[PDB]
Amino acid sequence: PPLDLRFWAKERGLRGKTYPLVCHSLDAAAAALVLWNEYLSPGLRDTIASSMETDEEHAGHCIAFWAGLHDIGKLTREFQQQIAIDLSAYPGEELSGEQRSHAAATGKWLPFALPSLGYPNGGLVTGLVAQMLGGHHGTFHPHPSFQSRNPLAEFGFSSPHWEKQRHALLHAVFDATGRPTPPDMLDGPTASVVCGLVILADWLVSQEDFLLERLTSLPADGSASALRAHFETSLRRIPSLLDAAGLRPITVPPATFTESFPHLSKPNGLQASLAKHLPCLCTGPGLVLITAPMGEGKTEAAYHVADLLGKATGRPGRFLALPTMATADQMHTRLKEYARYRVENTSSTLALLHSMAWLNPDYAPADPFAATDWLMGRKRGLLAPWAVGTIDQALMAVLRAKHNALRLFGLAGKVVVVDEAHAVDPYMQVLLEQLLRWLGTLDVPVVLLSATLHHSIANSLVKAYLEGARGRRWNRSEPQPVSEVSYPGWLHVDARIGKVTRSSDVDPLPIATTPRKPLEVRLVDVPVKEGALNRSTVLAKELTPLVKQGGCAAIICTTVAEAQGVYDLLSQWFATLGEPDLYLLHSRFPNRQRTEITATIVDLFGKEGAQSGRRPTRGAVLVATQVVEQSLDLDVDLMISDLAPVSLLLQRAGRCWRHEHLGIINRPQWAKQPELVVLTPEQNAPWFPRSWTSVYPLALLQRTYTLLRRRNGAPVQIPEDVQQLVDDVYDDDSLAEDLEADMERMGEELAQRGLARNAVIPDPDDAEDNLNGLTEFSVLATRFGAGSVRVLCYYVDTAGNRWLDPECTVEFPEQGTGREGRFTMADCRDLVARTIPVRMGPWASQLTEDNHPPEAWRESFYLRDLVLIPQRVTDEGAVLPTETGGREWLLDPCKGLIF
Template sequence: MPRHQPPSCPLPGGCRLLASSGSTVSSASTQPATALGLQGRFPKFRKSVSVGVYGSWLRPPALSREFVVRNNVPVDAAGPPEGIDFSLWGKSEGLPPGVRYPLACHLLDAAAAAEALWRDHVSPGVHETIAHGLDTTVDHAGTLIRHWAGLHDIGKITHGFQGQDATAPIRGYPAAEHRKAHDHVAAEWLQCALPEYGYPKDGRRPPTLMVAQLLGGHHGRFHQHVSVSSSAPLRALGYPDDAWETQRRLHLAAVTELLGHPAAPDQIDGTAAALVCGVVIQADWLVSQLSFIGRQLAGGLPATPGDLPRHLHRAREKVPALLGEAGLGRPAPRTGSFTAAFPSIDTPNGLQRSLAEHLPRLCEGPGLLLVTAPMGEGKTEAALYAAEVMGRAAGRCGLYVALPTMATADQMFTRVTTYLRRRNATPSTTTLLHGMAWLNPHYLSQQDTAPAEEQLPPDNPGSAEFRRLVEVSEWLRGRKRGLFADYAVGTIDQALMAALRSRHNVVRMLGLAGKTVVIDEVHAADSYMLALVTRLLNWLGRLQVPVILLSATLHHRTARTLIEAYLKGAGRRRNAAPIPTVAYPGWVYASAQSPHPVTVNPEPLETTQRKPLALHPREVSLTGDDTTALDRAIQEELAKLVEQGGCAAVIRTTVAEAQHTFHRIAEWSARHARATGTEPPEMYLLHARFPAQQRERVTEDIVHRLGANGAPNGQRPRSAILVATAIIEQSIDIDVDLMVSDLAPIHLLLQRSGRCWRHEHRGILARPAWATEPRLVVLAPHRTDAEDALPRGWSHIHHPSLLLRTHNLLRRWANQPVRVPEDVQELVDGMIDDTDLNPDNPHQDLDREATDLAYRSLGENAAIPPPGRATRDLYRLTDHDIDEAQVATRFGADTTRVVCCYSDSHGHRWLDEALSEELPETGELAHGGFSTGQVRAVLSRSLPVPGRWLEDHAEQAAPPETWLTSPHLCQIRLLVHRVGPDGSVHGPQLGGRRMYLDPRLGLVVEP
C-alpha cells in the first residue's frame, strides 16, 4: 500500500456506514444567544463545564428544562436497532434528567476542535517537532491528530461507564463485571483494534501501542501496556464479541470514515506522542464545556448515521469561535531592533548591544541563551528582546517568564505586559500563574471592576487599552490551562510541574512547547529544584524549545550543568567538545540543532560603572538565642541615619527575628530621634507572614517610596528603615543607602547588595553625607570554629557549611572593596571551590555534599525520565501511586495557608477584629458555590505557615464544611481568635505555640 493512502474501511458485515442519501451537509444554526436560551446563563458563552468563578472547579450550571423544551432537544434519542446507537452517551453531567449528549457527537466535536487547534493555535515550531516525531508531513500529522482526538473516548462504550447515569436505560446490552475506567479501556481496546486499520503491530515499539497509550492518557495519566499473546487478544483482555464490541467497532468505523481515514504513521517518537496527547486533552476540554454542548443540542441531534456529516460540519463551523472565546490564538512574530522594543532606553548598555549585534545571526533555529550579569544591568530587557529573536527563529513566538517567588512574579507581570503592549499590534492573552494570581490588582478581566478609564494613562495597567492586551479568558483561568495563553508570567513551579511525574504534565509541556521559556534568578534553585530544572531542560532541548536563563550570581559548574542538560536533550553526543566557561559578565548561546555549536560573547562586555561595594563583616559575640548583641550592633549601624537622614534595609533570617528587630528598632529610633532633635524614620516591615492583601499593600508602598520613581516625584522619605526577610533580595526594585544583613551564603549577600545604590548610575538620588559608598554590613558570629556558633534559625535556613565558609571568605577578603562585576564570580565560585575555607569543620562540608546529593536524588526520582527513556513508554511519565498533592517542585515545601478569624461570645465567626464582616460559611451562588467576592474576601486575608504547626490540631483549625467543596477554600485552615466582651483578643494555642495576628507585625508565634 502506498504511503499515506488509506486502506479500505472495515465495517461489520462489510457494509459502508454512511449512505450518501443521508449525508447532505447543511448550515449550522446561527440563532443568537437569546434565542438559544443561553443569555445570562452563559454570558458570551465563556463559562466552561469545569470552570466557575475565577477558574474554580465548581459543579457546572445545568441546562434548564425550559431550554430543552424551547429548543426541541430530544430527551431520549435512541439510535436505530442496527447501526450506531445514539443512546450511548458521552456527556450527561449538567444536562437535565433524561438528556444525554451522544458519544458519537462528542467524538466528532473533539476531532473538530483538534483540527482547529492544529490549524489556528499550535505554533509552527511545534508542528515541525510533532511531524518529525511522526516521520511525516505537517499536514498529514494534523489529519492524524484530528483522527486520534475523535477516538479518545471510545472506551465509554462499556456497561461500566454507561451504567453511571441511572437515568440512562441500557437496553439490549449484556452486563459486565469489570469496572475499568474508560480511559484505560481506550488504551487496551485500541491496541487490538487499530491494526485492522493499517497500524503496524510488529516491532520493538510499534505505533499501534503508542497511539493507544497516548489516547488512554487523555485524563492525564498513562496506562501500562499489557502484552497479550492470545489469538483472541480482545477476549483475553475482557472484551467479548458482544453488543458492546459491535458498537465500539461501529463508532471507530464512523469516526475513521468521516475524518478521511489518514494512513497510519510508520513510527511515533514518545516526546511527540506526549505533545499529541496534550492537544487531544485540550480539544476534549474545549468541547466538554456546557456552553458548547448547549449550542450543539440546539442544532438538533443526529437520528441516523447519515446525519453525522452534518453534525461534524456544524462542529467545524462553531469550533473557531470556541477557540476565540477561550483565548486560544497564535501570537504573531515581533520584529525590530532593541531600541524599537525599548524606546525609553536611549543607549543600550554593553550586554544589550552585544546581544542585539550577535544573537540574530546565531539563531538559525532553537537554542539556549545563558546570561550572567550584575544586578541592575538590564537583564530583563535583554531577555525580552532575545526572546523575540529566538522565538522567530524557532517558530514559537509565545513567552513564559518564570520567577522564583509569587512576589517577584507579580512585579514582573506588570513589566512584561507593559512591554507587550508596545510590541503587539493585535490583542493577545497574557496570564499570571501562581496560586494567588487572581488577587493581583493588575491581573484584570472583564468581570473585575476597573478604575475610571479617563483618569488612567494608556500605559497604566488599569486602562481599557492596556486590558485589551492583557485580558485573559475565563477558560484560561481554569486549572492547568494558563500556559495555553499567548504569553504568561509566573513562578518557576508552573514550568517545573511539566517535569514532575504528576497528572496532566503533558498539558503543561504542550503549553511550554510553543513559547520561549525565560527562567530568571536561576541561581535561586537548591539541589532538589536544580534536579528538576535540569530534567526540564532535557525535555525542552528535545522539543526544540528556545530557553533563556538569567542570573547575577551563578556558580560556573552549575552554569555548565544547565547548558549540558539542554544540549543532551537536543541530541548532543557525549564525546562532543566541552562546554566553554561562561565569562562574567557575559552570555553564551548553545544551538539545539546539530552539530550544536556553543558561542560565547565574542568580546568582553562593557558594564555600568559602579562604585565598589564595601562588604563589611561585623562580628558579634552570640550566646545561644540571645539577640541583645545583634540588636546593639544594628542600632549602631543605623545611628547616623536617624540623625542625618537616609534609607536603609535590614534583612533578618527568620520571620520571628524580623518582627523582633522591627519592634526594637522602632522603639530605639524614636528615643534616639527625640534625643537628637530629629524626626524618627519611617518604619516598614515585610515578610511572608502577613495577610496577602496587607503584604501586597506594604510591598507597593516600599517600592513607591524607596524605588527609582520616588526621588524624581519627591516621594522619597527623609529617613526610612525597612526590616525584612530575604523576600526583598530578588526582583523588588528598591534603592537604599545602606544594607545590613544576617550572615548568608555569599551569592545571596551579593544579591542583597543589588538593592543598595541600585540606581546610582541614573543620578536621581541625593545621598546623605554619611553614605559615601554602597555598603553591606554582614552580621556574623565572632566564632567560626563550630556549628553552635550560629543561631539555630540561621542553620535551619542555610547549611552551616555555607555560612561558615562565607564568613571565612569575608575574613579573607579583609574589608577590601568588592568590584562589581570584576570580583563577583571569584567570590561565588570560591565559596564552594576553595578547599581551605572551613578547616575547623571538614565534617560539615562532607555533610553538605551528602545532603546535596540526597536532594538531587530525590529530585531525579520525582522527575519524569529523560526523553530518551520516555520515548519508549509513556507510562513512565506519570505515577499512578502518588497523588498530585504529594509531588512538589520545592523540597520540604510543607506550607499551609491559614486565615485568622475572630469568634464572638455567641460563637459567630468574623473576618475582622471589629466583628463587622462575617466569615462566609454559606455560598451565594445558585448551585451553592462561593462567589468571587466571598473567595476574594477569604484569600486576601490568608497567609502561609509551616504545615507541621497544624499536624495534631486538625479539628481546632478546621474550616467550615461548606468550604470543602470549593477548590479555592478547601485547603484553607482557620486560626480562630477569641474576642472577649471587653474587646480583648486572644489568639489560638496549638500545642506549644500561641499565635496571634498583630496589625503591625503580622502573625506572631510565641512559645
C-alpha cells in the same frame, strides 16, 4: 454495517437528552484537525510530522483520525448501561465487575483493531498510538500484556455484535478524516505532545453550549453521508470555540532592537552585543544563557532574544517563568504593554499563571490580550498563546501527575524564558534540568536569564538542554559543555550540532554595564547571650551617625523573631529621642498589611522617591528578613546584614546605592562609601546561632565567613569580583575546616536532589516507546520542604462570638455574598487578604475543631484549607496571646504574628 446511533457518549446536563458516541467522536476529530491548522505553532506542527516522518496535511489527518477514537472505550456494556438504554439486540459481553475506565478500554481495544486499517500488528506506532489515546484523561496505562492468541477476547471484547459496532465506529471516523495511512515512526515525546492536542480537543467539544446547539441537528442515521454532514458541521463550528477561549496565536512581526523598543532611548552595552551578534547564530532551535547584574535590562534583551528564536523555530507562543507570584504580576504588565505596542492592528489572551491569579482583579474577569473564562480553568493556563507565570507552573509539566502532557503541549509551541535562574535551589534545579531536557528534544527554543550563577549549575543546565536535543545523555568521558561563566556575558547553544558559542568568541568588548563604586565589606564581631546575638551595643554604634545627620539604613536578620527583637530594640531607642522613622517587614504579616508596607518602603527608598524628592531627609531605618532579597526597588545609604552565604549577601547588598549613578540623591556626610556591615558572632572551627544553622547550612556560613576574612576588609569590585566569589565559596575546599559539618552540607544537597529525581517523569530516551512512566506513582511538590499553610486569626469574646477585628464589630462570615450565599472571587479576595502564611511545623498536627473552618467554606477552593487561629479578647477588650496547637499565638499590629 449500519452503525446504530443509540450508543451515547454524553448524558450529563442535557436535560434528559443524550449525545451519540459517533457524534462526540467526529466532533473531537474535527476539533483536533482545526487545532492542527489554526492553533498549533507552525514550527511545532513540523516537529510532530517530522518525528512521524511525513507531510503535514497527512500528519494532521492521522492526528485528526486518532483524536476521534479517544472515547471508543465507551462502546462497552459497562459504560453504556449507566443510563437507561435498550440493548436487546446486543446480547453477550456481560458485566465483569472490573469497572474499567473507558479510557483504559480504549487503550486496550485499539492495539488489536488498528491493524485492520494498516497498522503494524505489534508495531511501536500501534503501541504508542493506543497508549496515548488510552491516557486521554491524564493517566497513561501500561501496554496491554496478554498470554493467549486472541487478546481482543482476553480483554473482554467478545460479543460479535458489540464488536461490529466498535468497528463501524472505528470505520466511520476513518472514512471522515479521509482514511489516512499509518505513519512509519512516532516516539514517546512526540506522542505525549500529540496527547495534549487530543485532550484540548476532547475539552473543546465537551462544553454544554456547543453540545446543546449540536443537539438540535442530530443526523438521522449511521449513513456515511448523514455523518459527513455532521463532521462538516462541526468542522465549521470549532474555530469560534477557539475564539471564545482566546486561543489565536499572538504573532509579532520581525523587527530590530530599536524598532521593538522605540521608547528605550539608548541600548545597553549588553543589548548592543546581543542585538548584533545573535541574528546570525539563531540558525534554528537552541538555547540562550544570558547572565548579568540587577537593572541591566535583561528583560528587554529577553523579549528580543525570544523573537529571533521565535522566527527561527516557527514558535510565536510565549512563556516567561518567574520565581514569585509577585515578580510574575509585575512582569505580566511589562509584556502586555509590549504586546500592545508591537502587535499589528489587523482575540487571543495573555495569561497570568499562579495560584492567586483569580484574586488579582486587574487580571481575572468578572480588550485584546484580556484573560478569558475558559482559559481561567484549572490546568489550561499554559495553553494560552502568550503567558507569564511562576516557574512552578512549568515544572508541573515534568512531575508525575495527571495532565502533564497537556502541560507539555502548551510549552511545546512556545519560546520559553526563565528569569532569575540563579534563584532555584538544588531540588528545583533537578526539576528544571529535566524540563530543559524534554524541551530540548522537542525543538522549543529556550532563554535563561540570571544574575551571577555558579558554574556547575550553568553547565548542568545547558548540558541538560543538549542531552535532550541529541537524544543521549552525557558520558563521564565527554568534555563538559561549560567550564567558566562570565558575569556579565552571554552564551548560545545550537541544537543541530551542539555548539556552545560564548560571548568572548563572537565579540571582544567586554560587555558594558553600569559603572559603580566598589562595595565595602566589614566583618563586625558581636557578643553572644544564650546562643543568640545581643546586638544592642553594635547597633547604637553603627546607626548613631544616622540619628544625627539623617540617612537611609537597612538591617537584615537571618530569622523573624530576630528582626522582631531588633525592631523593639530600635523602637525603645527612639522613644528616648523622642523626637527617625522605623519599619519592619517579614513574611508573617497579613497579605493586606505586607503589601502597603512594601509600598511605603519602595516609595521612600525607591527610585520614584528620589525623582519625586519624597526620600526622607531625616534618618530612616528598615528592619528585614530575607524578604529584602526579592523584587524590591530599594536604595540604602547603609546596610547591615547578618551573615549569609555570599551569593545571598551580594544580592542582599545590591540595594546599597542602587540608584547612585542617577546622581539624583544627596547622601549624608557619614555615608562615605557603599557599605555592607556583616554581623558575626565572637568566638572561643567557626560557630553560629542554631537559628542560622537552621536556615543556612552551617558549612556554607563557615565557608562564606572565611572567604571574607581572606580579604581583610578589602572591597568588592562590581561587577568584576562578583563571579569569582560565587564560584569559589563552593569550589575551594580550603574554606572548609569543619569536615563533619561540610559533609553534612553535601549530604543534605544529595537528599534534596535525590527526592526530585523521584518526582520527575522519565528522561525522553527512556520514554522512547513507553508513555506509562509519565503519570505513574504510588501530591508532588515543586519545592523541597514542609511548606506553608495559611492562617487567619479570628477574635473571640467571652460569649464567645467570633469577630474579624479585635474590636469585635465585624461578624465572622458563616456565609458569602454571592447568590444563595455562595462565596465569590470578590469574597475570597477580601477574605484571603487577612490570612497570613505560616511555616508547617509540629503545631499543625495538634489542631482542634475550632481551628477548622465553617462548613460553608469547605466548598470554596481558596478558603477550604485555611487554618483558623483564635485570639481571645477580654471584657475590657485586650488581645491576649492564645493557646493553639501547643504554642501561644499573638497577632501584633506592628510586629506581625508571634508564636
